[PDB]
Design a protein around this ligand. Structure first.
Ligand SMILES: NC(=O)C1=CN([C@@H]2O[C@H](COP(=O)(O)OP(=O)(O)OC[C@H]3O[C@@H](n4cnc5c(N)ncnc54)[C@H](OP(=O)(O)O)[C@@H]3O)[C@@H](O)[C@H]2O)C=CC1
Length: 338
């Protein structure tokens, strides 16, 4: 017996976290937006005895997790995954910022009140909350877990990218500020800060033409045409399966108490992804562009070093690499259209 609450459980990472949690025989209560969502989640796993679901139509509102904490006082672990990953933002602070910040409070306020036997808590943040624009481009720099993105609130408002990056920064700020501004904090907080999350969905069932994931970075490649220009993008990446695992080690492991945990397997550009696909998918070579080896040089010259040694030590397992992650992503999308 050992109960774990996971919010927004139909999400890309969360669904992996759920699979792995269930495989280690935890009891899992996931929250979902709708009744439809919930019943779909249970059917995907063929209704195990150790998996239930509660409905939180909006994780951000005041008291959003009030009923479930009171109805499930046996739980000890809270994994928070839900956050608007995109919208069509007409106003950053209304649509995006203040939700992330005043919403993260209305999760922790809910737990400080009614999460009585809750001991370990894990929030999913981002590498975008760690790295600053100027630093991330410094080839000579070394960004670690202590680094904070120094973006202003006024800067977060300029556009939706600054918006999203700002939401991550100010929301995780709020989460530590909470455990410092309250007295008998009965739980400990760990945080998972990934770069771009690649990898397959938990179930090939769920594949749609455009994946509501950062694996749309990859998918966008497959919608290119041979004579098309390759859209520039780059940064760190990590596999959804290692990210999900990290969330579990975050409360299983005691050294994880009060830790920011950087999740990053390596670095990519779009050339990296093209190369890997053309190389390993013969039924696609000649149906998308080229220019091989660009990445190596671009990465060496235009990106800092992510030093996540302290994170990779704490976690202690080995990561998927780019070839395998990209492969599993694409192999899954191919074998879904038919
Ligand atoms: N994905 C990446 O590459 C990166 C991810 N992150 C972090 O990863 C976390 C998980 O996103 P991911 O799982 O990666 O991809 P998803 O976008 O698939 O996760 C989205 C999930 O969050 C739920 N959700 C979002 N806002 C609300 C809300 N206001 N009320 C209720 N449910 C909500 C959705 O519910 P429904 O599906 O029912 O609408 C969905 O299940 C995010 O919090 C983000 O900060 C950080 C850096 C990069």
């Amino acid at each position: 017996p050992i109960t774990v609450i996971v919010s927004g459980a139909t999400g890309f990472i969360a669904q992996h976290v759920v699979k792995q949690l269930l495989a280690k025989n935890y009891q899992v209560i996931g929250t979902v937006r709708s009744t439809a969502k919930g019943d779909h989640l249970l059917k995907l796993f063929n209704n195990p005895k150790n998996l239930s679901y509660e409905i939180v139509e909006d994780v951000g509102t005041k008291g959003a997790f009030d009923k479930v904490l009171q109805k499930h006082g046996e739980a000890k672990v809270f994994l928070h995954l839900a956050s608007p990953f995109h919208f069509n933002v007409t106003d950053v602070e209304k649509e995006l910022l203040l939700p992330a910040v005043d919403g993260t409070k209305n999760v922790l306020q809910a737990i400080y009140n009614f999460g009585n036997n809750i001991e370990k808590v894990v929030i999913t943040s981002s590498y975008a909350a760690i790295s600053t624009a100027s630093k991330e481009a410094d080839k000579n720099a070394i960004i670690t877990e202590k680094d904070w993105n120094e973006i202003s609130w006024q800067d977060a408002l300029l556009n939706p990218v600054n918006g999203y990056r700002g939401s991550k920064k100010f929301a995780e700020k709020a989460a530590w500020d909470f455990i410092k501004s309250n007295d008998n904090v009965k739980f400990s907080l760990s945080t998972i800060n990934p770069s771009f999350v690649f990898g397959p969905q938990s179930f090939g069932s769920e594949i749609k033409q455009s994946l509501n994931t950062s694996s749309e970075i990859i998918n966008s490649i497959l919608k290119l045409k041979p004579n098309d220009s390759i859209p520039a993008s780059k940064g760190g990446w990590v596999d959804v399966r290692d990210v999900a695992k990290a969330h579990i080690i975050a409360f299983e492991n005691e050294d994880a108490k009060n830790q920011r945990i950087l999740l990053n397997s390596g670095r990519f550009t779009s050339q990296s992804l093209v190369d890997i696909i053309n190389d390993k998918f013969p039924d696609l070579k000649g149906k998308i562009p080229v220019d091989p080896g660009s990445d190596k040089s671009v990465i060496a010259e235009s990106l800092a070093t992510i030093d996540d040694t302290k994170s990779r030590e704490l976690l202690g397992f080995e990561y998927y690499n780019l070839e395998q992650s990209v492969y599993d992503t694409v192999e899954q999308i191919v074998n879904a259209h038919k």
